[PDB]
């Protein structure tokens, strides 16, 4: 079976720069007769389905920027997005269809680079609704920051807590190319009301001192 | 417009059978081979096979031979992907793409995500995250919404029925003790809140529930 190998895996380039991706095949994908190479490039954004970009290894599908270019033949093909933008963040796949079964490369993720942004942090206490049912969860929103690496911490009355917190992160923003993470501290109402101050601390590459959002239960 | 509309999210237990569908609208369901592609959670795509929409003759790939069944209801411009004796490994989402003689997929469907498991469906309690009784103003307020304690993984989220799409960060689900949790945040101008109203529309296609929690101050 034709084995597809994509390079590289991930790839971070700033907006405006032209990036290049490679896609090699186990064997020739050139139909000597039709004289066409059966390799297509698909772009697939987070949560969406795949979106065909190029076919016949070179021909660009209808309704597509001349920015995306497909060169290659035989086993050596490459996709080149000239002048890269944030709207291009996705995973790119090359599929061979010369001989069944059809196959895809492992996909090449294209991330975008930018100016280190400081996360804007927000904190929210347990809602009346939730508390109403012996449950209390505190949420912190570290939003629109860069680079994507960030660390968070929770303190209940100066003390640090590790048990009960669940974290989530989002894909690069389709607009600003920044990042957002979400930490939420869950625990019982029987607990939440025995302690006063609740504060989450965000530590980012944009500093040595963490951003600190806090609230005191004896004031809500 | 040319489009493919699949069935809803499915949650079956190990061993259970399932049939997802792919409705063909916009063209003649009998002129192109319809294929089915799958994507293991976090993994790449994989060609399963394809049904001849003119002969019925289905061709299957080896990795998907036995247990999987392609078919169609020609009269309804619809094709069906069936999977019997389901395994936890089979968890993923399935697409169906129209295929051309130029050898590529010019149109896919949102894909149907099936999840195998023993856990039981459970509605998602939804809580409103409004800025507590504090913080200056800085003319930029960030609202919240915390979905939680539900199962069948997919629980789509939007604000003011979709009207609010900018400044929105909805985070990925997170499993703990057979129950997921997801948060989503909007950030509107101070001037538009609590002036105009902001509510998070949250749905969970399994528990067949749906909550439109309007965020009110504290």
């Amino acid at each position: 079976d034709i084995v597809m190998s994509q390079s590289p895996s991930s790839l971070a380039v700033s907006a405006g720069e032209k990036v290049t991706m490679s896609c090699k095949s186990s064997q020739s994908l050139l139909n000597s007769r039709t004289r066409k190479n059966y390799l297509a490039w698909y772009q697939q954004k987070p949560g969406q389905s795949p979106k065909v970009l190029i076919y016949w290894a070179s021909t660009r599908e209808s309704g597509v920027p001349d920015r995306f270019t497909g060169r290659g033949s035989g086993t050596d093909f490459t996709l080149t997005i000239s002048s890269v933008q944030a709207e291009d963040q996705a995973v790119y796949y090359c599929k061979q269809a010369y001989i069944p079964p059809l196959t895809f490369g492992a996909g090449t993720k294209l991330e975008l680079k930018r100016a280190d942004a400081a996360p804007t942090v927000s904190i929210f206490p347990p809602s009346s609704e939730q508390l109403t049912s012996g449950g209390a969860s505190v949420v912190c929103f570290l939003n629109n920051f860069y680079p994507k690496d960030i660390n968070v911490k929770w303190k209940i009355d100066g003390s640090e807590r590790q048990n009960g917190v669940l974290n989530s992160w989002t894909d690069q923003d389709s607009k600003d190319s920044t990042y957002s993470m979400s930490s939420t501290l869950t625990l019982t109402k029987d607990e939440y009301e025995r302690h006063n101050s609740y504060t989450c601390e965000a530590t980012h590459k944009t500093s040595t001192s963490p951003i600190v959002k806090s609230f005191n239960r004896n004031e809500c | 417009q040319i489009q493919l509309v699949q069935s809803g999210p499915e949650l079956k237990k190990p061993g259970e059978t399932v049939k997802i569908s792919c409705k063909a609208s916009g063209y003649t369901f009998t002129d192109f081979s319809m294929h089915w592609v799958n994507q293991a959670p976090g993994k790449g795509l994989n060609w399963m096979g394809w049904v001849n929409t003119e002969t019925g003759e289905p061709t299957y790939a080896d990795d998907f031979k036995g247990r999987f069944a392609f078919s169609l209801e020609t009269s309804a411009s619809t094709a069906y992907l069936q999977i019997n004796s389901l395994k936890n490994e089979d968890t993923a989402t399935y697409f169906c793409a129209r295929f051309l003689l130029r050898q590529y997929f010019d149109v896919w469907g949102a894909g149907t995500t099936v999840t195998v498991s023993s856990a039981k469906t459970t509605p998602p309690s939804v809580y409103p995250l409004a800025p507590g009784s504090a913080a200056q103003t800085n003319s930029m307020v960030t609202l919240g919404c915390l979905v939680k304690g539900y199962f069948p993984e997919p629980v789509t989220v939007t604000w003011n029925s979709g009207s609010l799409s900018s400044g929105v960060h909805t985070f990925p689900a997170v499993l703990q003790s057979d129950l997921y949790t997801l948060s989503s945040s909007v950030t509107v101008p101070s001037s538009t809140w609590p002036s105009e109203t902001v509510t998070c529309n949250v749905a969970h296609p399994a528990s067949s529930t749906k909550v439109d929690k309007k965020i009110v101050p504290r």
Binding site: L29, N31, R33, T34, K36, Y38, A97, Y98, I99, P100, L102 | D31, F32, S33, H35, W50, N52, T53, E54, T55, E57, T59, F99, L101, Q103
Partner: peptide
């Protein structure tokens, strides 16, 4: 793959695989 059990030679309508194609010069069933 066509349909009556065999594996190679006639056909040509709803194809899957570029190696099986020939240049435009005929009708067929698709």
């Amino acid at each position: 793959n066509r349909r009556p059990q065999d594996v190679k030679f006639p056909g040509g309508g709803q194809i899957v695989g570029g190696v099986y194609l020939l240049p435009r010069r005929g009708p067929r069933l698709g």
